[PDB]
Design a protein around this ligand. Structure first.
Ligand SMILES: Cc1cc(N)nc(C)c1CNC(=O)c1cnn(Cc2ccc(Cn3cccn3)cc2)c1
Ligand SMILES: CC(=O)N[C@@H]1[C@@H](O)[C@H](O)[C@@H](CO)O[C@H]1O
Ligand SMILES: CC(=O)N[C@@H]1[C@@H](O)[C@H](O)[C@@H](CO)O[C@H]1O
Length: 588
């Protein structure tokens, strides 16, 4: 099961399967998440340890129990992989580190006006993995495994990673595969795959893979059948291509914006066995059950469901759960009674999960944010909203006051600049509106409504759901809460074109009551406050970053003016409507 909690001042003892340098702990957790064996990680900031070569140190760990001895160590951050965490799994990491120099193979040097300009050049260079900017020349870099070979504290250097895996690369996306055609170049790794697309997906998430050649099982040389060769080159593109019977080549799809493959392989393969280390064997009823059994057991990486009469009892046959060192079968045999497949633990396309005084946001920064517009005499943006599921958006009830809740509404998602919206821009239409039963147009109670879209949305890195809060467990005092929208930047201002963001401290429910003596601030409301949500931000998100994670805490509802001194914003408190949410939303 998904496990997002972190452990402060804590180091896990032993169990190392890999280690590298990473700029912070969440980056290390992402490495853990994508490593085939990592369940647990411990990270050491520059302050925590005094062994120079351990600083910025990221240690990836496995354990047959799923647990390891935990030792106290001031400043060390331990935690879990995000395997099994669905759409919270993400290869994208846009943080820029001030005062930090991440080192590697410097292969390209330029002069640019800002760190941002440097990040962009890295992002658009097929070979760039991370970069460093000084203060103004710009260094693009790669390294073994994509992590820096060293990380040093230098006050006037900023560093960050290519935003390629955030879908921001202008580099092309190449969906073409080439039949009977082999690449040469630099082989960076070699694994067995059942077909070419699995191999292409492994290439896409492999740090140093830019293209691949796969060898089918009809391949002349028997010992090389099903070999998937991950490759790269200095230029980043193949320098030759050789015609070759029974040979399939293609490219990493990491630059692809809307065809980025999921980092799991969900096809079932009849007549094939996947060899590996045996982890557990049990009698389940059919291949699908066997695959779920593998997905729920986190150390399982792939399986074979046997169909030999000797391996079946009554409707139930042996389900061989297996793993290997690198996540791929150690053998693939093609004449067997039964079917093989992979664990879905890393699938991230989901099933729902558990502005005055701000600055420009960046594309995909807030991927759950939507704009709710109305086609009346003109089309206009009225409210924000939060994507919480393929078909579901959460917003404010008052957005529909006296409004013809029919074929008038158009929901926009995955969008940063409203001015970019033309009548050809794709949009979601409303299939159904769920205003809270106890809502009333002239009162602020239960300011919340669901919207079922007429079609489900595909999750991308610029369009995906925010997670909701766990139970009524808001005893936790959130410290890093933010609010976004295209609303008025001042009282009596205008709608903004570029989605805005602001960091607002939360307030107490009694202190908030003290400042609105004319209304009743209730338990089901949460308050927060020269910086505020304003007109047109209605219904948008109030998000809090907990354990490096983002939670949806409030729905922008109301305030007296905008950004008025000691009159804070009132948000519908999401914790207190989970019952109704999950209710209306897990049905129909
Ligand atoms: C105007 C505004 C300024 C601001 N700082 N921020 C926002 C987002 C807005 C936009 N808001 C609305 O346009 C609006 C209209 N109607 N509603 C529902 C509602 C809720 C609460 C009350 C008063 N109340 C508080 C507790 C009990 N009652 C009255 C109306 C919202
Ligand atoms: C517009 C363009 O093609 N710019 C590239 C730059 O990205 C690359 O770093 C450099 C290599 O020296 O060659 C030039
Ligand atoms: C020409 C011009 O002023 N463009 C600005 C840009 O500089 C600014 O970053 C953004 C809001 O942050 O609004 C727009």
């Amino acid at each position: 099961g998904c496990l997002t909690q972190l452990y402060e001042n804590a180091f896990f003892r032993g169990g190392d399967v890999a280690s590298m340098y990473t700029p912070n702990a969440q980056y290390c957790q992402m490495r853990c998440t994508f490593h085939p064996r990592c369940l647990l990680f411990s990270f050491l900031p520059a302050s925590s340890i005094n062994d120079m070569e351990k600083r910025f140190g990221c240690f990836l760990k496995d354990s047959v129990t799923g647990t390891l001895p935990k030792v106290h160590r001031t400043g060390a951050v331990s935690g879990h992989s995000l395997k099994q965490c669905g759409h919270q799994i993400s290869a994208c990491h846009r943080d820029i580190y001030k005062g930090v120099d991440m080192r590697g193979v410097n292969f390209n040097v330029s002069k640019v006006s800002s760190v941002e300009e440097c990040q962009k050049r890295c992002t658009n260079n097929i070979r760039c993995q991370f970069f460093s900017y000084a203060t103004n020349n710009c260094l693009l870099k790669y390294s073994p495994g994509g992590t820096p070979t060293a990380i040093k504290v230098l006050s006037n250097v900023e560093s960050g990673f290519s935003l390629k895996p955030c879908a921001l690369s202008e580099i092309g996306c190449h969906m073409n595969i080439f039949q009977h055609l082999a690449f040469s170049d630099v082989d960076v790794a070699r694994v067995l795959t059942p077909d070419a697309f699995v191999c292409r997906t492994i290439c896409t998430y492999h740090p140093n893979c830019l293209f691949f050649t796969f060898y089918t099982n009809v391949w002349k040389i028997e010992s090389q059948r099903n070999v998937c060769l991950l490759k790269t080159s200095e230029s980043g593109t193949p320098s030759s291509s050789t015609p070759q019977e029974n040979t399939i080549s293609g490219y990493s799809l990491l630059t692809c914006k809307r065809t980025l493959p999921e980092p799991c392989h969900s096809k079932i393969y009849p007549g094939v066995d996947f060899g590996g280390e045996e982890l557990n064997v049990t009698f389940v009823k059919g291949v699908n059950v066997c695959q779920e059994t593998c997905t729920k057991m986190i150390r399982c990486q792939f399986f074979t469901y046997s169909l030999l009469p000797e391996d079946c009892k009554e409707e139930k046959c042996k389900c061989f759960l297996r793993l290997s060192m690198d996540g791929s079968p150690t053998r693939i045999a093609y004449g067997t009674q039964g079917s093989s497949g992979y664990s879905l633990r890393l699938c991230n396309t989901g099933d729902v999960c558990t502005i005055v005084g701000g600055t420009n946001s960046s594309w995909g920064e807030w991927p759950w944010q939507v704009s709710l517009q109305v086609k009346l005499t003109a089309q206009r943006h009225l409210c924000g909203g939060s994507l919480i599921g393929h078909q579901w958006v959460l917003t404010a009830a008052h957005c529909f006051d006296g409004l013809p809740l029919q074929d008038v509404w158009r929901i926009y998602s995955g969008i940063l600049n409203l001015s970019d919206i033309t009548k050809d821009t794709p949009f979601s239409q409303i299939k159904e509106i769920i205003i809270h039963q106890n809502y009333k147009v002239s009162e602020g109670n239960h300011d919340i409504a669901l919207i079922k879209l007429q079609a489900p949305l595909n999750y991308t890195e610029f369009q995906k759901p925010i997670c909701l809060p766990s139970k009524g467990d808001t005893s936790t005092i959130y410290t890093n809460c933010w609010v976004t929208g295209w609303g008025f930047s001042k009282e009596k201002g205008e709608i903004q074109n570029i989605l805005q963001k602001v960091n607002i401290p939360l307030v107490t429910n009694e202190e908030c009551q003290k400042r609105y003596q004319d209304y009743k601030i209730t338990q089901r409301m949460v308050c927060a406050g020269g910086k505020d949500a304003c007109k047109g931000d209605s219904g948008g998100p109030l998000v809090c970053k907990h354990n490096g994670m983002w939670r949806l805490v409030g729905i922008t509802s109301w305030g007296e003016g905008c950004a008025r001194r000691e009159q804070p914003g009132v948000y519908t408190k999401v914790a207190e409507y989970m019952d109704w949410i999950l209710e209306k939303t897990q049905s129909s």
